Amino acid sequence: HHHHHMKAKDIAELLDEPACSHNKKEKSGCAKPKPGATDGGCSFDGAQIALLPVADVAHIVHGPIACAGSSWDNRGTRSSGPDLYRIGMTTDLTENDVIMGRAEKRLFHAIRQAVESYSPPAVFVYNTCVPALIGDDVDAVCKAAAERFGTPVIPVDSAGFYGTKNLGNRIAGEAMLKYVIGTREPDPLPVGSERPGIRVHDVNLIGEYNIAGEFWHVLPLLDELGLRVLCTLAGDARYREVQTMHRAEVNMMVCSKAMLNVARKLQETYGTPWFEGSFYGITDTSQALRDFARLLDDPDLTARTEALIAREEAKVRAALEPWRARLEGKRVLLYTGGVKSWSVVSALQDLGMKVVATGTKKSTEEDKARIRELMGDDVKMLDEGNARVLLKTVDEYQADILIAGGRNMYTALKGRVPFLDINQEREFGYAGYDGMLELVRQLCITLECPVWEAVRRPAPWDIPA
Amino acid sequence: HHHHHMKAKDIAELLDEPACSHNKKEKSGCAKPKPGATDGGCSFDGAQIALLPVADVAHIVHGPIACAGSSWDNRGTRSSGPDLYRIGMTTDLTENDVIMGRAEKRLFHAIRQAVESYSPPAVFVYNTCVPALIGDDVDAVCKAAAERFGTPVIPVDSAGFYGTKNLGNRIAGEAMLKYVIGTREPDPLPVGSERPGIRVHDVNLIGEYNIAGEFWHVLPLLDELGLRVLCTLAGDARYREVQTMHRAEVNMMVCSKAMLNVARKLQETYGTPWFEGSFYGITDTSQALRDFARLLDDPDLTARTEALIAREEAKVRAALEPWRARLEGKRVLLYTGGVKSWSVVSALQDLGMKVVATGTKKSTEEDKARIRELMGDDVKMLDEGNARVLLKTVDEYQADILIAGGRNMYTALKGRVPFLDINQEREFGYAGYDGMLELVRQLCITLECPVWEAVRRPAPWDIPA
Amino acid sequence: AEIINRNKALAVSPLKASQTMGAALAILGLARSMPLFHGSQGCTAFAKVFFVRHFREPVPLQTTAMDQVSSVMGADENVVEALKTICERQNPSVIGLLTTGLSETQGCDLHTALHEFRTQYEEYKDVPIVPVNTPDFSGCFESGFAAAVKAIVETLVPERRDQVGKRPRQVNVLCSANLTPGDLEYIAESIESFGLRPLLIPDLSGSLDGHLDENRFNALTTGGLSVAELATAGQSVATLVVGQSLAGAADALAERTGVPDRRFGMLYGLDAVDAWLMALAEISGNPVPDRYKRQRAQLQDAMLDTHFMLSSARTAIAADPDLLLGFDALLRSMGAHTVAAVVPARAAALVDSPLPSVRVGDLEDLEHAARAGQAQLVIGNSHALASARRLGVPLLRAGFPQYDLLGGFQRCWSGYRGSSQVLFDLANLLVEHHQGIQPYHSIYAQKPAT
Amino acid sequence: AEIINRNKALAVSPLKASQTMGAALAILGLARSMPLFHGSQGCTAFAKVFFVRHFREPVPLQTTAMDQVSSVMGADENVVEALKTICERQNPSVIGLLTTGLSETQGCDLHTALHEFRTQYEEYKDVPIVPVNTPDFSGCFESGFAAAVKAIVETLVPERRDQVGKRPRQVNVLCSANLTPGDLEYIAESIESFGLRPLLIPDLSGSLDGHLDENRFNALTTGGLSVAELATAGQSVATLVVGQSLAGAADALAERTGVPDRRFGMLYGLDAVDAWLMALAEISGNPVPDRYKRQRAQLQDAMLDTHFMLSSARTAIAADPDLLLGFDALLRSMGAHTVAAVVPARAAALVDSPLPSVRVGDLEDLEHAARAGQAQLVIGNSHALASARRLGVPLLRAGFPQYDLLGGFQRCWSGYRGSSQVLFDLANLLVEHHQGIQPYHSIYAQKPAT
Ligand code: SF4
Ligand code: SF4
Ligand SMILES: [Mg+2]
Ligand SMILES: [Mg+2]
């Protein structure tokens, strides 16, 4: 087909990211998967991961039940109000809809039903493999529905077969830049918020998804400094916040490189300067706050930023001291499964734990660069998705705990090895200074557990004489 | 001992009730039980069943753990606020307390602890068998504690070995007349409660225990008519309401004859006229309201009473009609286990059900008089507490359901017979016009159940060829 | 029952799970097996998360990795490359080749792509591959599971007729999707108590029962129905069918073996368990053990003690047809009425139901129906929690998925003891939530400012 | 553990239940038995309500009907009149003659009143009467039960020594108060799986298991331990003791028969069940069945999956010493800490506990200790719910009474599977109640107020 050749051109434009340092390298993250040896998620999963936390919007999945039916209500995000994003919404295409070409009609009436029943600020329509393969003009359906029903309908053209979850995050960002960002001016500063001596600056947090409500540890610090977050994309976000992103003074890239197209395009279009950073660990949280003052050119903000850091660092270092002995010197094996695992490494450094980070050939070039930075330039990559290689690596380095994404949980649990989840599905917050306390509590919970000696000890009948 | 001969004199004075019609008869309710063939409760039990619904009071049980430990938090009453009556409070006497005679000291410090920890309006102290035998002057301990701690202590001298649960209800009433009633004037009519044309009259409801909140179906009717209930003894009662009982204009005896000493003594001492009645069934609820108007000598109240009756009877007869066919002609076997079972008979009459009431030799003379009134003067009494006799009676009269106290529940359930509970432990209200609806729903629930044919049919392997 | 078919364009709060997942679950009930989805990487990833969150165990699941190029130009080579890769890296006892909506839309003929692998890699001739046509746009999780047992029966059972009875004590059991590893343990043990030898097809109680295997690492299913044992299905005296959904697999087994069968719905309630034990007693010749006679009297007691709260109780059920029909019969023996019944897709067994109607729909439809009918409880999976909170009523979790309840994957609903526990749980939920007569505050009350 | 003894004058929300009730429960574990309280009618009435509300079954329980006159003048005649009345009306297999606080205070010698009945009514010589001194002011429900098993052993077992091993597969089991009818079923079945013939002393799983008997009406216990079978105690090969509270009854049985014993606590957790099955394998000579080997791997998995929520969990327990020690050990293997432990009375087994201290108090004491220790969940009976609700924490019902939970009287807590279900239940309560990071509302937020 001729329509599918023009789609593969757009995919190559997204993979060409001049803002990243590994643009002149062979893109290993988005490489052709090996049949019968693949473990990752599709582009549809990637776009929904980035746009679902926009809480008040109708999130319609266009396609058969395999796409939404197996994946709905599984976002580790927390909302402070609306929860329409938790409702599974899908066209649930029948065989006759694919054969008779009745999927555009089905999608059109699905947007109408969502608008009538829930009256949302906006509707996001996600494209999937079946409608992308067949003749399905998702863009034109969304354009027609926006006009006929009066509610903005944004099309995220991210069918699963386009690529990996990281490609979906780029397509999600592209959909926001093209249809949402720049469509509404920010609200005036709330009445009563006038703090004399505090200059309020507008900022964006791109890549913060408020997993388990962890951003609600950072939000009070930003508030104390006088930083109005126009939009946290997409942690606890509302459609109306996203529209105003163009009027931010500084942009912060939070633990992500798949959303780098957003920060770059916002600097090219609106002149908004940006910076990469993280809120995982003491050193990282303080550096993120220091970078904001550096780009906002305000000496009063800079002085208050140092004052906040000196206060929060004194409180957190005092609280971490009774625990310091319990986690000092514990060996940690970190695995990078493209689930932003390197961001939590800095937090483990603030505890005196030697970490052995490892990755595969299918991992991104940024994951590989961070492994050469700490382990060494002649490091060894696992390459294949064989979990027995990862288990062997634990025993090789005498690792006490495996820190990786939730997929590798049963590899460590069944291999009788302590594990700590750091994926977009955990129930514990590790961001900011307060999050450091929860991280050491969770590390001690699994490490100091008597369950490990019980599962390693054999049955009393399987004991030799 | 000579202290125990003076106690048995007071017991005979309580059993001499000139207000009752069966005073010149052989008191069968309070008769010497048969050893190895007894089923009833002790005087302490009846005393607690009568005063525990005085919700805000500290009810301390003086004695070993057999009395309170097995009986606490099992009152079918419902309160609208305070719940201190739900806390089990007991002296929990040790062996050394009984031997060394340290129980008065124990009780004295138990009142102190209850006053200090919970600050109640009053503390009630209930005597039990062990402390009664060893002498323990409960009255003098209460008197001393009232003075030293400033909170009224009311002694309810009702050790279990004095007699039956009915004797305990008399002792509870005596304790109220002697220490509580007449100690405080009623509150002025609440502000805003002014209703032109309505003369507010003060009444008392003696014997209404608010089982499952059923009195909250009668309370709005009394309120509409302009009847201030000074105190409902003891349904949803407070210590302060009981103090004002002497200033009532009319007293209503609710489904009880054990509290008849209260109504009689209030008429002898304060001149308060009284009447016997019930709130079980349409005819009874309307008769109770008609009797109030008859004794309050107010033509405006009498006219509004007829208007309330015509309104509530039209609403309830219309609501009962769709059910009328489902319960018409169903045979009911009623058993009187001294648990005021005859009060619900009138409600069953309002449904067109032929009821076969039966009792024993150990039943009260009032239970026997009501059986001669309906069944006939040559009726047959079961005499012994053998439950197989009661089961035989069900099959003899072709009974469809057994209506008796919760004790006989497993006799009917295990005997494959439908049962309806009417004791001070049920979770459904049957009082007033609204209660009639719940009664027919509960009757249909157990009668129309397919579970009965399933438990009567034999196993498929126990079916011959 | 009269079916109210799907009519609305938007499935809101989907009840239905894919046909492909159910088929993978059946493949998962085979020892040392690897299910293989022919489609994009995302279908497998979502299925893996679905099962991992329900069972709380590692789940073997692979993909042919269909990209933009292989979806238009053709993906038969991906099937051959995946079969070779799994055969060399994990050396399986059996592989399940299941198709997705993407592969069926393209037009991938299973019997062509499999043939090409068989002619290129003859070194893996003895590794049986079960082919099943399971596109996501058709059927559901339950029917998909039922389709995989039919394909399993047609692939791993020999086509004979002369061996019926060769294994005199062996009795086949066709198990359905909603039979938990706990239900399967009751089936096997009850059969074993009659002296009989159970042959469970498939056996999830061997793979996903929730056990810590001896090996530190396993790539395939740690247990279940072996292909060696499954080949002895013709030698069995009788075949018991548990769940109406497997009617097509029971016919496939009956034509190919000749082994006579007795069919059952769910083993729920007084009558379903009676008929289960009667067939077992007749087949083995031995009487019903005293152990099961005592549990019948315990169920009768459980039905007496819970009748007060369950007679006339209005329930709302959102589950597969086998669970709906199994729970309706259980509740009907108590006098409880199913006032709302929603299924993910049509089923022949629904036509023969005592309910007036059953809706094909989603969890939004369930909420609308339960509210109309004034439901007091909801029986449904974890997704049904929000519907129940919005309705203000308790939820009793059943069916897939159960990501919010630890140990829910292995609950035994089956049997006399299993039926009693459902009655106690429905009774306890109904009691805990029952708000009695609300306090009335008299306008003349002598009550201190409450 | 250091026992913080009873100190305050007022017991608030009593945890403790009378010794007389516990002794009656042990008598209730004997077939066709009638427990008889020597005291006023009210003690028996309260005990009957207590058991009827927990088991939800009819409970045989009589009284000697001591009134004001017989309490001062002497009540030995009431004992004789009650024994004669029960012997003629119900013709029992065994009668339990238990004293109350009232009878002990008066000075009623059991062995005088019983002797007088034996010399007056010789027609009832073959009806054994078990005399046990259990006044309400001493001990508790659990110790009372244990004191009734001692009297039962001394009354219905012959004093011999030369018959050890006459029934080669027979193994006595001395059961404690907190062993539910479902726990007793696991004990008997596990023993039977090793080929041994269990002899449960007493057997509540035969009387109060919750079954509908063949007879429409039964006046005595429908089942349990028969006196005919109990006389064959000396003929066994070994006696297993389940629950440290039965140390005195195990010594009484050991001196009178010579049958050697191995003593255990509650069969909760990996180590307690391991030692239970090891003793059984050694006694019978046969290995541990594959069925129990699979359940050990299943418990190891539930421990892995619930470690995340149970490691470091702070719990508050208000239960009998056997349950406290049995739950503490189960929780200690998971890394969970018992931060509050309240028992109704002292126990020797408490002295040998890893807990730093145990308080002898009530539910009010539990509420304060749990609040001080920052407990996250409470383990106790139906009475502990109001303390848990005041604390804001979930409750896991355990022990007597359980008047608010249907089917809780028969829950099997013992073994690998029974232990696994406690881990899933504690984990699930903990997760359902876990309130995470609370939302912070920014003072500069672009969030619509309406
Ligand atoms: S008052 Fe007497 S008969 Fe009643 S519970 Fe107390 S000791 Fe027993
Ligand atoms: S988008 Fe494609 S790969 Fe992803 S779930 Fe849907 S069909 Fe599967
Ligand atoms: Mg598991
Ligand atoms: Mg029962």
Which residue among B212, B441, B448 places its CB closest to the CB of C335? Answer: B448
Question: Which amino acid is present at A231?
Answer: C
Say which experimental method was used: X-ray
Mutate one of C273, C294, C307 to test the B interface: name it (highest B CB count within 10 A): C307
Interface size, chain A vs chain D, as Cβ–Cβ contacts under 8 Å: 109
Domains A29-182 and A183-455 are alike in CATH topology: yes
Domains D3-161 and D311-434 are alike in CATH topology: yes
Q: Which residues contact C39 (CB under 8 A, 6 or more apart)?
A: A129, C20, C63, C64, C66, C99, C100, C101, C102, C103
Q: How far is B349 from chain D (nearest CA, A)?
A: 30
Q: Cβ–Cβ of C407/D301 closer than 8 Å?
A: no
| Residues of chain C found within 8 Å of residue B80, distances taken between Cβ atoms | 439-441, 447, 450
Cβ atoms of B448 and C266 closer than 8 Å: no
D137 CB under 6 A from ligand 1?
A: no
Question: Which amino acid is present at D151?
Answer: A
Interface size, chain B vs chain D, as Cβ–Cβ contacts under 8 Å: 217
Q: How far apart are CA A264 and CA A17, in angstroms?
A: 9
C120 touches B: beta carbon within 8 Å: no
Residues present in chain A in total:
465
Cβ atoms of B84 and B55 closer than 8 Å: yes
Number of helical (H) and strand (E) elements in chain D, helices listed first:
17, 15
What are the distances in angstroms from CA C427 to CA A15, C384, D209?
58, 19, 19
What are the distances in angstroms from CA B217 to CA B238, B312, B433, C298, D284?
19, 12, 7, 39, 67
Cβ atoms of D83 and D92 closer than 8 Å: no
Question: Where on the phi/psi map is residue A352: left (φ > 0), alpha (ψ -120 to 50), or beta?
Answer: left
Cβ atoms of C253 and C157 closer than 8 Å: yes
Burial category of A193 from C-beta neighbours within 10 Å (exposed 0-12, middle 13-18, buried 19 and up): middle
Cβ atoms of D113 and D79 closer than 8 Å: yes
Cα A172 from chain centroid?
A: 12
Q: How far apart are CA D31 and CA D33, in angstroms?
A: 6
DSSP 3-state of A357: strand
Q: What is the largest CA-CA distance in chain B?
A: 82
Q: Cβ–Cβ of D436/A446 closer than 8 Å?
A: no
Class of domain C3-161: alpha beta
Instruction: Output the residue whose Cα is nearest ligand 2's atom 6.
Output: A67
Q: How far apart are CA B194 and CA B190, in angstroms?
A: 8
Breaks in chain D (C–N beyond 2.5 Å) sit after none
DSSP 3-state of A42: strand
Q: How far apart are CA D214 and CA A269, in angstroms?
A: 86
Which residue among D40, D69, D86 places its CB closest to the CB of B36? Answer: D86
Class of domain D311-434: alpha beta
Q: How far apart are CA B27 and CA B24, in angstroms?
A: 9
What are the distances in angstroms from CA C405 to CA B201, C142, C389, D427, D431?
58, 21, 16, 9, 9
Q: How far apart are CA B145 and CA B127, in angstroms?
A: 15
Q: How far apart are CA A125 and CA A385, in angstroms?
A: 32
Q: How far apart are CA D446 and CA A190, in angstroms?
A: 9
Residue D25, token pair as written in the block = 């429960």
Q: How far apart are CA B198 and CA B200, in angstroms?
A: 6
User: Read out DSSP for C108-137?
Assistant: --HHHHHHHHHHH-GGGTTS-EEEE---TT
What architecture is domain A183-455? 3-Layer(aba) Sandwich (3.40)
Q: Cβ–Cβ of B446/C274 closer than 8 Å?
A: no
Where do the domains of chain A lie?
29-182, 183-455
Q: What is the CATH number of domain C162-284?
A: 3.40.50.1980
Question: Which amino acid is present at D361?
Answer: G
Mutate one of D55, D211, D292 to test the C interface: name it (highest C CB count within 10 A): D211
Q: How far apart are CA B401 and CA B423, in angstroms?
A: 16
Q: How far apart are CA A110 and CA A88, in angstroms?
A: 12
- Considering just the CA atoms, what is the radius of gyration of chain D in Å? 24
The ligand placed nearest to the CA atom of residue D52 is 4
Q: How far apart are CA D355 and CA A268, in angstroms?
A: 66
Q: Which residue of A has its CA nearest to C86?
A: A36
Atom number, ligand 1, closest to the C-alpha of residue B67: 5
Query: Residue B233 pairs with which residues in a beta bridge?
Result: B206
Q: How far apart are CA A41 and CA A129, in angstroms?
A: 13
Q: How far apart are CA C116 and CA C426, in angstroms?
A: 54
Cβ atoms of D32 and D93 closer than 8 Å: yes
Q: How far apart are CA A65 and CA C101, in angstroms?
A: 9
Long-range contacts of C228-233 (CB under 8 A, 24+ apart): C229/C199, C230/C30, C230/C152, C230/C156, C230/C157, C230/C199, C230/C201, C231/C156, C231/C157, C231/C158, C232/C166, C232/C167, C232/C170, C232/C199, C233/C153, C233/C157, C233/C172, C233/C199, C233/C201, C233/C257, C233/C259
Cis ω before A234 (30° cut-off from 0): yes
Q: Cβ–Cβ of B445/C300 closer than 8 Å?
A: no
Q: How far apart are CA C131 and CA C83, in angstroms?
A: 12
Residue C413, token pair as written in the block = 């609903």
Chains in contact with C, counting 3 or more C-beta pairs less than 8 Å apart as contact: A, B, D
Q: Give the position of tokens 């003593």.
A: D263
Q: How far is C56 from chain A (nearest CA, A)?
A: 8
User: Read out DSSP for C365-415?
Assistant: HHHHHHHHHT-SEEEE-GGGHHHHHHHT--EEE-SS--TTSTTGGG----H
Residue D295, token pair as written in the block = 């359940």
Pocket test for ligand 2, best of C38, C46, C66, C105 (most atoms within 8 A of CB): C46
Instruction: Compute the C-alpha angle A43/A48/A54, nearest 5°.
Output: 150
Cβ atoms of C83 and C122 closer than 8 Å: no
Residue B384, token pair as written in the block = 């012994």
Using a threshold of 3 CB pairs under 8 A, tell whether chains B and A touch.
no
Q: Where are the beta strands (DSSP E) in B119-258?
A: 123-127, 153-156, 201-208, 227-234, 250-254
Alpha helix segments (H runs only) across D362-437? 363-373, 384-391, 415-433
Q: Cβ–Cβ of D439/A236 closer than 8 Å?
A: yes
Residue D336, token pair as written in the block = 């969970």
Q: Cβ–Cβ of D62/B37 closer than 8 Å?
A: yes
Residue D121, token pair as written in the block = 């009514």
- Give the residues surrounding ligand 2 with Cβ less than 6 Å away: A 42, 44, 63, 66-67, 128-129, 159-161; C 39-40, 42-43, 46, 102
Cβ atoms of D172 and D157 closer than 8 Å: no
Q: Cβ–Cβ of D102/B130 closer than 8 Å?
A: yes
Q: Residue A2, Cβ neighbours under 10 Å: how many?
A: 5
Q: Which residue of A has its CA nearest to D443?
A: A193
The ligand placed nearest to the CA atom of residue B156 is 1
Cα C365 from chain centroid?
A: 22
CA nearest to A179, candidates A247, A127, A125: A125
D428 touches A: beta carbon within 8 Å: no
C406 touches A: beta carbon within 8 Å: no
C-alpha of residue D46 to centroid of ligand 1, in Å: 9
Domain A29-182, what fold? Answer: Rossmann fold (3.40.50)
Atom number, ligand 2, closest to the C-alpha of residue A158: 1
Where do the domains of chain D lie?
3-161, 162-284, 285-310, 311-434
Cβ atoms of A433 and A319 closer than 8 Å: no
Question: H-helix or E-strand containing B242?
Answer: helix B239-243
Residue D89, token pair as written in the block = 């009306």
Q: Is D140 annotated as a binding residue?
A: no
Q: Is A129 annotated as a binding residue?
A: yes
What are the distances in angstroms from CA C99 to CA A101, A129, B348, C44, C66?
21, 14, 66, 11, 12
Q: Which residue of C has its CA nearest to B184?
A: C446
Q: How far apart are CA C327 and CA C422, in angstroms?
A: 10
- Considering just the CA atoms, what is the radius of gyration of chain B in Å? 23
Q: Where are the beta strands (DSSP E) in B73-210?
A: 89-90, 123-127, 153-156, 201-208
- Phi, psi dihedrals of residue A389, rounded to the nearest 5°: -70, -40
Torsion sign across C-alpha atoms D149, D152, D154, D156: negative
Q: Which residues contact D411 (CB under 8 A, 6 or more apart)?
A: D180, D182
Q: B381: number of CA atoms within 13 Å, CB side?
A: 20
C-alpha of residue C305 to centroid of ligand 4, in Å: 6
Burial category of A282 from C-beta neighbours within 10 Å (exposed 0-12, middle 13-18, buried 19 and up): buried
Instruction: Output the residue whose Cα is nearest ligand 2's atom 7.
Output: A129
Cβ atoms of D24 and D35 closer than 8 Å: yes
Cβ atoms of B357 and B336 closer than 8 Å: yes
Q: Which residues contact A447 (CB under 8 A, 6 or more apart)?
A: A327, A330, A400, A401, A418
Q: Which residues contact D44 (CB under 8 A, 6 or more apart)?
A: B38, D37, D61, D62, D63
What architecture is domain D285-310? Helix non-globular (6.10)
Q: How far apart are CA D254 and CA D261, in angstroms?
A: 7
Q: What is the largest CA-CA distance in chain A?
A: 82
CA nearest to C195, candidates C273, C327, C283, C306: C283
- Considering just the CA atoms, what is the radius of gyration of chain A in Å? 23
User: Read out DSSP for C177-233?
Assistant: TT--HHHHHHHHHHHHHTT-EEEEES-TTTTSS----SSS--SS-SSSB-HHHHTTS
Q: Which residue of C has its CA nearest to B451?
A: C334
D127 touches B: beta carbon within 8 Å: no
Cα C111 from chain centroid?
A: 27
